[PDB]
Amino acid sequence: TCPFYKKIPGTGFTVDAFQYGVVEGCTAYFLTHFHSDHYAGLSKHFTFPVYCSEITGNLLKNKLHVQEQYIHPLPLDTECIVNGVKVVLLDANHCPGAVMILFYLPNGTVILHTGDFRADPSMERSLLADQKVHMLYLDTTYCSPEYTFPSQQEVIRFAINTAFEAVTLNPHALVVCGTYSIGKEKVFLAIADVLGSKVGMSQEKYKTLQCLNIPEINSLITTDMCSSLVHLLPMMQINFKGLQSHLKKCGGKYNQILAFRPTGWTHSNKFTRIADVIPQTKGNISIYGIPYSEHSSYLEMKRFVQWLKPQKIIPTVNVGTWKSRSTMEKYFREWKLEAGY
Numbered sequence: 532t533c534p535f536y537k538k539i540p541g542t543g544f545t546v547d548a549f550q551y552g553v554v555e556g557c558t559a560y561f562l563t564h565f566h567s568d569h570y571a572g573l574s575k576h577f578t579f580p581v582y583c584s585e586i587t588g589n590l591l592k593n594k595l596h597v598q599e600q601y602i603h604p605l606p607l608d609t610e611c612i613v614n615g616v617k618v619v620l621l622d623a624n625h626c627p628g629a630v631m632i633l634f635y636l637p638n639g640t641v642i643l644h645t646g647d648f649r650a651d652p653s654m655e656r657s658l659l660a661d662q663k664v665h666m667l668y669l670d671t672t673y674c675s676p677e678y679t680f681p682s683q684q685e686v687i688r689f690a691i692n693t694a695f696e697a698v699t700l701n702p703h704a705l706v707v708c709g710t711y712s713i714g715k716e717k718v719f720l721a722i723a724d725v726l727g728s729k730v731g732m733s734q735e736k737y738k739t740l741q742c743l744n745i746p747e748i749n750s751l752i753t754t755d756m757c758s759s760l761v762h763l764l765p766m767m768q769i770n771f772k773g774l775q776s777h778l779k780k781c782g783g784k785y786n787q788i789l790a791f792r793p794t795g796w797t798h799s800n801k802f803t804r805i806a807d808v809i810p811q812t813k814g815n816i817s818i819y820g821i822p823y824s825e826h827s828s829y830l831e832m833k834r835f836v837q838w839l840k841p842q843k844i845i846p847t848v849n850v851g852t853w854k855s856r857s858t859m860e861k862y863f864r865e866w867k868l869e870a871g872y
């Protein structure tokens with residue numbers, strides 16, 4: 532039975548609610564982005580309208596084999612009507628095709644659902660600026676003071692320099708990046724660009740990337756593992772055993788591997804600065820752990836909410852326990868006091 536926090540009151544709409552069968556009274560199902568927990572239960576047999584970004588539509592079509600008649604791509608930053616209600620999709624700065632959704636309700640109420648997002652100052656100069664928000668449905672993945680991380684920009688800079696260096700010392704070294712769904716593509720496309728290479732990967736993942744409206748993508752990727760000095764592999768395979776195994780499967784063309792794991796947060800954000808970072812090494816194989824987050828840090832979240840001044844906040848992550856719910860309440864109260872709103 533679909534939870535309240537996936538329902539937009541006053542409408543027949545839900546958000547990211549596909550794993551409940553047919554929801555009683557839902558005329559339109561919104562999907563914020565193409566990640567598995569959020570699209571869970573979508574398939575070729577789904578028969579009701581799905582509202583989403585272009586990129587999210589490409590992916591529902593080509594990967595999930597959803598029938599073209601039930602996919603309703605909407606453009607970003609544009610006032611659109613759906614079943615009598617004015618909506619806007621905004622870029623969520625999360626993964627390719629991820630959106631936030633503004634609902635302007637018949638009764639003059641306005642509702643922002645963030646889906647998954649990583650808050651950024653640029654958001655303050657969008658359609659969100661122009662009016663008051665009554666309810667906020669907030670991605671609270673990192674809602675606790677200990678979650679600090681560096682900027683996406685700082686992290687990609689580190690990984691570029693580290694890769695360039697290792698391959699200039701040894702031009703038969705290979706670079707491997709871990710992946711398991713969309714998002715974090717900027718890590719590996721940036722590395723391949725500096726190095727003058729295409730990015731080699733499997734057929735399934737090559738497909739995924741063709742859906743994402745990247746300019747000139749065909750010139751940047753390949754399934755030729757032998758004509759490629761950057762390769763993608765499942766995140767699980769990013770350990771000493773996996774990397775060795777894969778090194779034997781290229782045809783003696785590389786004699787070393789430098790590999791990257793874009794993790795979210797782990798306990799060494801609380802001490803190690805990015806410039807200090809050093810890899811674990813074993814023979815001719817090296818693994819750097821980099822904190823590339825696609826969600827708001829605590830400070831990012833706090834600043835965003837304080838700007839927005841919503842009347843009510845509804846969390847959409849870490850909601851299952853009383854501990855978590857109560858802890859988040861505490862922080863939202865602190866933010867409100869500190870501001871005055």
Ligand code: NI
Binds near residue numbers: 564566625647
């Ligand atoms: Ni996500």
